[PDB]
Amino acid sequence: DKLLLANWGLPKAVLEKYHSFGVKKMFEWQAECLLLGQVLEGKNLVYSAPTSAGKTLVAELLILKRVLEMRKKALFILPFVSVAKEKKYYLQSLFQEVGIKVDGYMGSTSPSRHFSSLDIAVCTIERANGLINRLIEENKMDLLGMVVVDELHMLGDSHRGYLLELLLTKICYITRKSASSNAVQIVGMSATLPNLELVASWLNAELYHTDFRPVPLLESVKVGNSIYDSSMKLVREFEPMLQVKGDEDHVVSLCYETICDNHSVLLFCPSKKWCEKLADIIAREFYNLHHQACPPVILEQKELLEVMDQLRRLPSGLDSVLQKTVPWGVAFHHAGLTFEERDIIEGAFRQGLIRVLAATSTLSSGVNLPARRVIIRTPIFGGRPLDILTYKQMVGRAGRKGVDTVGESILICKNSEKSKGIALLQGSLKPVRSCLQRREGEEVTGSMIRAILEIIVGGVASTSQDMHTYAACTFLAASMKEGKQVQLGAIEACVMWLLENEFIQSTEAEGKVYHPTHLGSATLSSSLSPADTLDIFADLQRAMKGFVLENDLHILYLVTPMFEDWTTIDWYRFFCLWEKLPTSMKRVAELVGVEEGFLARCVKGKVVARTERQHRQMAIHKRFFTSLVLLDLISEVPLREINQKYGCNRGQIQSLQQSAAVYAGMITVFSNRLGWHNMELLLSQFQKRLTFGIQRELCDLVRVSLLNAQRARVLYASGFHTVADLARANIVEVEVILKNAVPFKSARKAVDEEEEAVEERRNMRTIWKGLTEREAAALIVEEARMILQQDLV
Amino acid sequence: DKLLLANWGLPKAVLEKYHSFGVKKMFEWQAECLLLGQVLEGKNLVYSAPTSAGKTLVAELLILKRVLEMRKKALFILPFVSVAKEKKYYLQSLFQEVGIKVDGYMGSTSPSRHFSSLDIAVCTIERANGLINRLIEENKMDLLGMVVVDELHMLGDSHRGYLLELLLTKICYITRKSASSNAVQIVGMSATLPNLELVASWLNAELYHTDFRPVPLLESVKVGNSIYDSSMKLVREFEPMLQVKGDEDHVVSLCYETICDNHSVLLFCPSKKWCEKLADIIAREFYNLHHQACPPVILEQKELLEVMDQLRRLPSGLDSVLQKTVPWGVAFHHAGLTFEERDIIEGAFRQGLIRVLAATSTLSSGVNLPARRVIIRTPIFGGRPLDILTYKQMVGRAGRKGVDTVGESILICKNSEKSKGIALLQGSLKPVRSCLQRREGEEVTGSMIRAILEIIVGGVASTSQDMHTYAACTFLAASMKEGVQLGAIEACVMWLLENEFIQSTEASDGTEGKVYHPTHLGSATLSSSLSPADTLDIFADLQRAMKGFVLENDLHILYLVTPMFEDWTTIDWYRFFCLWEKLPTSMKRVAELVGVEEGFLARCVKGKVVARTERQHRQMAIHKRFFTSLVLLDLISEVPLREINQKYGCNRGQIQSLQQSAAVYAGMITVFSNRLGWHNMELLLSQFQKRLTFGIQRELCDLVRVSLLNAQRARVLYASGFHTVADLARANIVEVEVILKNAVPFKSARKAVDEEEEAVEERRNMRTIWLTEREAAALIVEEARMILQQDLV
DNA sequence: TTTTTTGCCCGGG
DNA sequence: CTGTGAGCTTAGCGTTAGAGTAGGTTTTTTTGCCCG
């Protein structure tokens, strides 16, 4: 009964919470992983097990042990905000009865407390690195007592997760420089990489690996009728029941085959367009079955009506394809949907009301959504062969906790190029290699630059000897010394780059000693990338030369998120959208460096930049086009009009809203630390406006009149009007309120002013077909009184 | 028995203060004035006495009575800040022992708490008309218990003082409107106008006027050798005691002829330069008399040992002329002297240490200095015939209240001037007339527009029928009913509509006609205390700033915060053109956006300032304000004042008039933008207002001894390390260098793409000091440790 | 021609 | 708008310059940081 969790010294509350939330006994692999000789003595640990096992239970027990016994702050680092929230509630629900002050840093969420009062901080990678920089800047690094790290195999990505090398390297360096019984214990989960012994020995960790699964997975590939296992054993020839030309690979039959068993099918797709198309086809066959009408389909239509009606509450309305599919238990789930459509369709699949769910990779990662069967539609995604890590992560969802006894998965392929499928079933992950590693013919990399930047700006390792001592702690150094048995000259080409771009200063004494500029501290405090800072700071300088206070577009530009290919841009539509801009906004285009000749060149084709002019002219226009969308969001333009106007979609929009609201807070901290306090107040005073939710005190008014919420607010800020009060107000009183609600804009033409600049000031005061307040104050009374005449009935 | 103040039943604490401050018995005209039929009952009072009488003792006893008999608040309205401050401290030391809360609103000094807390507010006219607008807007007029008006004859001054008509009209109108036992007793004091009974009848006041003064006045004209009485009766022929080179009028002998009896002289000159000439001349002859030693002048030089050193102790230094004259008890006093130099010279003259004082009109008004003999150098002043009021204000200074028995005045006149000279003695004040009156061929006057504006915007008399009911309360109407305005009232609202200060509302409450409401430009104009004639420029300057604001430097914020003046100085258009051309492109950019132009600057050198049309008339106002902005920048740029006087040609009196006015304009134009709803521009202006303070703290002034420590560099050192100069000598040069580099805002040494090299040269030249920071950081320690070995002894 | 994913901290009392 | 003496080179003798004065909040009180 060594596996019975009650023996392990858990507090009874947590034991019963595990009895509530989970299972009473650990798996045997978990009992081994906790009992590597020094792990319970505080040795660092790296381990790997399938995600269907109780992967985090080992870490959670190690978290609780250290925080009960050593009573020091712990940091839990997770790859995504959604996982960070899900795990925060789990950890709170598990530990709160013990009083462990769990909170976390993720998205816009913050503890609303100073860190030194928490016990567990749950973080995304971005905010875990940011917090450690501030612990180093505050020199409070002594507070941190543990770090826990999921998906430690992310070290090899240029986009994200290299921060996880820098983060652990900073911890190791400060510890090693102090040490040369652990100050910080590191626990890492790494999904069974090869050369995982290298990651373990780099961290001085114990290593545990198992392939144990609560349920087995039959990975297989389909070509033609033939079904092969991982060994290429032909196990079945498939029958294309419900044979139709509607799918030449008979995807419907593999789904229907499992629908006939009353089990749930998960179906990964190359694209949102293909995913949307494929869910329509499947639903039409369940329509075709039921309207022509072997096992029948069970539809549970009483619940599908509740789900499909609940989706009607959402501001954008129910998707015109979900209207076709959801009545049959067919849905699609991808990041082209809004954030709530995702949450509702996830919950409806977790309970099995939806039984077929077509999806992109958004169900591979970020949400744990297990299924009984996983179908993967092609080995090629876009123009490229599927990442074998994505393949493993997709098929890893085929297991369930006893809801079936096995998992199954099917790669679908054609008979040509079949080996490019089998290469996934027989392959394995590439060895992980740190992004710090230069190519022999190449300049230093942006992650090495940022690694070197952070230490200096925090005042750690200001000497080049200390920079070489830091670099010896990297996973690159551990990887190099293993593989070889040049980095000393890669530091120099970074420090020069940090000098030539003014992030650091050199001071004499024998040698040189380096310090942050304000452009250093600003880059670090905003936790921007240096490569992005040279675009943001170049935009900020050109505003100091002439900031248009007349309107929001110029300051939206400065706070507009930096994205690469946030959409495809139709440069001809952008050219038209710029050409028709109002005068006081076309003046913003000229001042930010948008140019007729560049848009025309981008209409006439496409450009790949070859000069520092061309490399930033793109970065100007791409940022400006993104601001034109943000301008329409704060102007409350309907999203259905934005999508048609810009080619955007309602998922891209909602992520833009969430990103802009954070950029305004970074670039306030950026300008605050460049000392540009006249720009900080303009940005901080605008951070208060760059938000998009309904002010609930107004809600019962905007519920009815569909007026712009500022009109509702002034009709609330004056006289506290409900709709039943607006029906009583005098049309002349409302006209005076509507006239004196706005910030002033004179109607006259000034001397030496173009009338095309005056017309905008008089137009901005109009309320709609050109309703002046004289007229609008009547129509608003007519609307209010005619509605009230139909609401008290 | 009615003359002895003890018999009037004062509270004994105030009797003891009057026994301390002056004569214990009232003058007979004061007892008669206080015993008009109803002035003690509460009826308004208008009275006149020569200013050397106890003119204000009447109003002081009326104040004290009503403030004790009623818990209502007195408002004491005085023509200048100097007399206002003096009256405040007098009234404080008089009433504080009774517990009456006396404070005031003057010249950028304000009470510790809002008017609700006070019993008496002593204020200038413009801060009186300010406060009265706040009492009307707050609807707190019930608090106003009494108004006491000095210099009520100023109602006819078109430049300033007509506000005393608007103020009293609005008090009378709100009294009439609300009441129609006196609600607000107005006590008015005036010089003896011909039509003073009309001013009394307008206020329904009782009238008293008398010629009694304790020291009788002899007026005379010296024409040629010959001295005439007021009747042109010859009294004496004067031959000069002193032979003097080029003293064709014997003015030096006219001074000396009473210096021989130890009596002081006050000499009024047409100009500052003519004062300095005459002070030098008179000093030369008193030196010559003593060097050749007529009776030798007694100089009391032991007392001048303080005064003349105290002028050397002053940061102005002892003026190049004052070095020569002050040892001999000759001084000059005019608006070009720094305010502390005036106070020292006033005190020495009041003590009798100075025995001849030349002055411009600055001692005719706003300063009480008596002298036995007043001499007026010409009947023509500055190309004008001298004003008969100004002459009587000058001559009124003759006679010293208790020291002397007779006052003498000599007007000096040429034989050609005789007709104009005699007319100043035989003449008398012109009848007062309100400036609200149109000339039959002229446009409606700005005094009426500001009158009609304030009622509307304050929420009073919002209908034309009420405007006619207001107009009937003016002193204009009282002037006319004794015997055209019908078009003036309607033309004003036509003007205030065409210039968007008010809103025409066609209210539906009846067919009777329109209602008028404030715009935001109305409220801003009123609550800033600006004239409508100024806010047509202050708006167009501020409106053209919104189109593109240079945050890169202070100059564009200062161009919004400078005072507005006509002929603050002469502008040498060549040394402006040569000085605009010399600006950095950081600031030559601002000149483009502000609207300064070569086609105007290079035309003023070659033509005349006469602007024929509104385009040119504003174009001139752009440039004159920009020139004032350069001077005001240099004052905050720590340019030494001796340089500024060379660079622009202003003087150390105008500079203080600019420093005092600009600090207030930073407040007014905040509130102007605040009411316009331009809350972004308000926040830039409100932050910048924190920098417009010019007094360095003496706690920092220790560091200011160091040659390299600009007040910024001293302050940031004191902020960084609270350093004594001993500690700056103790400091490490590298630590100092780090402090010097950390203190500044970041500016890039790099050039950016699509800059031009001048734009980056200005960032580099702005980062250095008049030395690179490393270089200065050595010299500063070598300087500090050179000081310390000299400072320890 | 086409996928999903992430940074900041304040203001009350 | 005026008037006349203030200013220029060699200096004996040309003609431009020149008065003084004023507007606005927030402010105190209980102080600071956790906890809004």
Side-chain angles (χ1 to χ4, degrees), chain B residues 9 66 86 176 200 245 250 322 324 394 418 481 602 658 755 767:
Chain B
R66 194 169 174 97
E86 289 177 359
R176 278 177 142 219
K245 297 180 182 180
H250 312 310
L322 291 175
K324 299 176 60 66
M394 285 178 178
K418 184 177 70 179
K481 78 183 183 180
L658 178 60
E755 299 200 286
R767 215 185 206 298

Side-chain angles (χ1 to χ4, degrees), chain A residues 81 107 124 127 134 272 335 342 360 527 665:
Chain A
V81 177
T124 55
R127 305 203 75 193
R134 292 186 285 273
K272 288 185 292 297
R342 283 167 45 149
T360 64
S527 62

